[PDB]
Amino acid sequence: TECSNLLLQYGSFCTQLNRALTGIAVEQDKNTQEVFAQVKQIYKTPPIKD
Amino acid sequence: TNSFTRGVYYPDKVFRSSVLHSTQDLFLPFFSNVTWFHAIHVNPVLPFNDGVYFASTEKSNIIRGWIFGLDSKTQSLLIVNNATNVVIKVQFCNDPFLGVNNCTFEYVSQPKNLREFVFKNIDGYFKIYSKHTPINLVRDLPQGFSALEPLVDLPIGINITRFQTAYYVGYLQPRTFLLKYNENGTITDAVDCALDPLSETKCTLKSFTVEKGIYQTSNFRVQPTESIVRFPNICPFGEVFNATRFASVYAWNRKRISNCVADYSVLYNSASFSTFKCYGVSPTKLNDLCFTNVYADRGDEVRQIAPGQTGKIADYNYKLPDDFTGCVIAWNSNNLYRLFRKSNLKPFERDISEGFNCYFPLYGFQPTNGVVVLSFELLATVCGPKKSTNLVKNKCVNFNFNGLTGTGVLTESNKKFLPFQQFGRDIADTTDAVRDPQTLEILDITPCSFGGVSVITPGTNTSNQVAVLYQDVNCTEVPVADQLTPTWSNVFQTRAGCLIGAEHVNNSYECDIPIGAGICASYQSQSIIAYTMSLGAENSVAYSNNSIAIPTNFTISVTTEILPVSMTKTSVDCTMYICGDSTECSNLLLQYGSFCTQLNRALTGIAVEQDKNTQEVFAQVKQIYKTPPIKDFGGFNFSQILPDPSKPSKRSFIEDLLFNKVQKFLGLTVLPPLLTDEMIAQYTSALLAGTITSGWTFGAGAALQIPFQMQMAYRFNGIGVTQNVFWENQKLIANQFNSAIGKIQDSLSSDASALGKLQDVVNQNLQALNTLVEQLSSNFGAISSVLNDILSRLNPPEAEVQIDRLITGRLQSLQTYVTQQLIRAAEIRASANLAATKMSECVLGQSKRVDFCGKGYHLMSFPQSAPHGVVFLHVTYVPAQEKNFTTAPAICHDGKAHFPREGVFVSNGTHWFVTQRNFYEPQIITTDNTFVSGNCDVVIGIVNNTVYDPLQQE
Amino acid sequence: CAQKFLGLTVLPPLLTDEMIAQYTSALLAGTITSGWTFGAGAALQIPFQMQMAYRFNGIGVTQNVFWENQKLIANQFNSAIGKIQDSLSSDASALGKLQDVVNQNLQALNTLVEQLSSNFGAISSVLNDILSRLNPPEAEVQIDRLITGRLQSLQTYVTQQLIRAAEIRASANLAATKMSECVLGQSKRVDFCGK
Amino acid sequence: GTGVLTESNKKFLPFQQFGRDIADTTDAVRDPQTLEILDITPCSFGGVSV
Amino acid sequence: KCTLKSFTVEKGIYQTSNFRVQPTESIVRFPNITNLCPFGEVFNATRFAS
Amino acid sequence: GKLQDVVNQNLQALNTLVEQLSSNFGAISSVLNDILSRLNPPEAEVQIDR
């Protein structure tokens, strides 16, 4: 605890860090969704590949 | 004891208005249980704590005077709090209420209800806050806001309180919380932290209103509850540290004994023996810390303890390293030599082996004048005795392996500790495993569980319900170390997290509040619902070797794609950010290798770049096309997108709607855009006109001139729609376009959903500044966060240290800001070159890029300006009303395969015709509309039909 | 114990390998069913062989070039996919950039993790033991300097992770472009879709 | 500090001697010697572009 | 020229200096306490012993 | 200029590092040698750490 109270002396350090990291995390999901989850439909691969 | 009675008060805080501020001032959480009332009717009250809050009713005084305060012994106040001279006394007639060593410290005379004397504590003295007493609550507990501060601090010093006197008492906890100050700086309903996870989110985001989303709330840990300080325990040390023998100049021992159990140099802890100095350790942690050195080792100069000092220790006397750990004690009243040494000494060197004839010889026992250190190792132990509980399995404790303090569970000694049988390290940290000092057969490899907490918030404008997920969790159970309110409350046992849940749905739906891991949530009889994220809708259309779907009709859809172009570019002048109005630190500004100048240089670079981004995105012209005064272009009501009417100074209607959506002396400034919103609107005009009047305004030299219907004719022709509908469907294409603009005007301009992506930059930029300025309110280890206070409080030789500490902190934060912005500038540059590319190939021409310039087959895009960005209305062609026709590539009987020139040999079961992938619009095979190479070939797909040659002409 | 307790964890992707594979299935299925005729979701069904004829015609050869060579073309295709099945095996190129990205991040943490042990000018780095050894008053260096050091290491980590993210975002933007132009579309661009 | 003193446009509760801004820099001070509070604006400042 | 350490400066606008406004007065505001602080009762006390 | 600006910023980035060395960072002097010449034994660690 003592070091956490001392870390708080570096005011709101991690709030900024956590936000940046979270921003990266949503950006990653945004990238996946944007890259391949591009379809509003899921066409099912035909059972007969003729 | 419910209804969320708000334990709020102004915590001696400066008046602030229109703000949201967080603190930890021991407020009253809404946890009240029972209170002491209804004593009499038609039973003494003695509740006590330091962390208390009192509230009650009124008829006269009711409390027979409000009191606070043992009995007639010490520090007894029993303040009357009545009209007749309230005094701070420190027990006879006041024992009962009045009516039906008397040393005083202070005099104040400060003077159904809701009288509150709440929030008490000492702070070395006294603390008390008080609230108004409304008389129209028509209930027992008022929805209130806060208590005020008449005067709180007085010379009381009560270590404990138990005095009072239809009654209410609450008890305080040192919790963090959020206080909302309205425009009049009145604290409105506050939000406790750890009251509930939604409140945790509100604290987390330092914002009461919380949009629907997954917010990462504070982490969670199980509490270590016990500790081990175990060692076999029980040497001369405890007695021989003192020695009559005094020969230390030619002697500094280190190991009088290798193993001590009698180690308690209280001589230092209480200074029961003499003066001392400890290096690297507390003087009091003598049985908490242990070293493998138990003994060691005078002169008028104890100044020569000298861990790297410039004394006689350098060459004659005993030397210690600058990086020395240990503790030294001295002796006096006591009534070998420090002769000259030609060589220098090394740390911990013990050398007791040219100045004419004076180098070889080498004290005085008479009272010439009234004119000893133990080194500490870094390690196991064998000193500083201590004992505790036995090994604790399956629950987490502190002090794992005694000499170290860990929070791991003491289980599973599945490690051999082969060479030494004592200690293990992790792949990534000092401590991984231990062998218990007394029973060397058991281990600590399981640190008390810990992880992050994500919270699902449905959006506070709809619901106050939440779901919570421990990011890494067994999904077997959740401990109670925190809200502490719910049970562990059927919850989806997902790896994403599982503490308190949501209906775990066996059905599937569109994604919302995406927790991640293929799991989404919503509030849809309102409750949190957790779903397995579904995919897009199933498409089951059959395909065959001869089945082709061909549109018979079409629509024009307008995709509104909004891209950031520029940042809310700023310039931080560190002279103020760090040193505003501070002249003492002025020397420090110069101290740097222009680091500040370089940080500002980076932001200036960013700003110039931002102007360049706007310039590429909008300024690709030399002569601007003035929108012709027509409103006559195929009837397309471009009047809705062009800045023609001059109602606003320059803006178009769509851009008006875009601009209708979407902080002083901060030490920084937000530089004006080079091109104002008015100029951008005018460049927008320059592009839209020209775009609808000539075409390639840049690429084709103002694009000569086009009737506009010829233009979109050619654009259809570009997308692959040739000689099909651009002329046949005049008044239909125009109508669909028009309707699409209506679709944007009442949809995104009413929501700003798609439009909020612009703010992904603006919000972040503001947050970045908000972070930066908020970062100022930080001590960084300095005595105070306020530089001017350091200057007003500390002298030069002492202030500079803390000034520099604060400066270093602020410089680290500023570098962080510059860096964050340099990277965001790069990202926006990437979006800006995308936007410029899109303006160039979507607006200044017809891009063949599929699903790039909007959804579907882009034929056109009409840009509009947005604050720090561009919105492209990409008018795209979409096929519609598809019919499943039979296809084949070829026919014969003419001795010619006759493959379709550009079309498809398609039939409705008969009437084999040829058309394209644009519209049904069937046509007779028409030899001139086919391509022949191969005749009656072995090629797959001949349908044995015939085609008329227009030149048969018989 | 590859991933230990350092506060450094991984949040699962929204789109899990099942979800990614599932979307990929849709994408391929759309490719073999509408090819390019999509109103960004509004697929128009075409027979695959016919789609190939149209794509071939879109590249400057006639539809009959494909049809005359239907057997050739389809058979060359089958051989080519087999070639890739083998050429992507035997750890070829370590699957290129994908390995690199993961390597770019695991190391990002091995570095961050290593920094945990740095003393930052202090005697030690084991903060819990530092507090045990000395009292907070005597911790301007023992704790706060250490904290500052870790602060910088984390800030460096996020900074580099943001750069990594920016780079990744650009890669993803290009990948998305390919996803909508190269697949679910016919690129007319040289080396956009490979040589 | 340094700044422009002006009559505030808002009365503040008597319990505090001074107020603070969003940037946590002093917003206003009640005069210890007078029954008034004066907004304090940081003295005009900014960059110089040549 | 100094900001860029070059005697010849390219045509353009440069972020050169820092504009702050010089204060025109020194304003001292303290409560009008006329009671000399009884430090003598603290430091010239007859008995500190206890 | 496009291709000059890049080399420029790269070199400038180097130029900056050179300038940075000149900083004392709050130290008694700017060069390790001076530190090593003035307060070496007792405070080299402190000044050097700075």
Residue numbers in the entry:
A (entry chain B): 747 to 796
B (entry chain A): 29 to 70, 81 to 107, 110 to 130, 134 to 143, 164 to 174, 187 to 240, 264 to 332, 336 to 398, ...
C (entry chain B): 851 to 1045
D (entry chain C): 548 to 597
E (entry chain C): 300 to 349
F (entry chain C): 946 to 995
Text from the published report:
Many pathogenic viruses rely on class I fusion proteins to fuse their viral membrane with the host cell membrane. To drive the fusion process, class I fusion proteins undergo an irreversible conformational change from a metastable prefusion state to an energetically more stable postfusion state. To address these limitations, we developed a general computational approach where the protein’s sequence is optimized for the conformation of interest (here, the prefusion state) while destabilizing the other conformation in silico.
Finally, the Spk-M design achieved stabilization through four substitutions filling cavities and five substitutions increasing polar interactions at the S2 subunit, including three interprotomer contacts. While most of the designed substitutions stabilized the prefusion state, the mutations N175R in R-1b, L130D in M-104, and T941D in Spk-M were additionally predicted to have a significant destabilizing effect in the postfusion conformation.
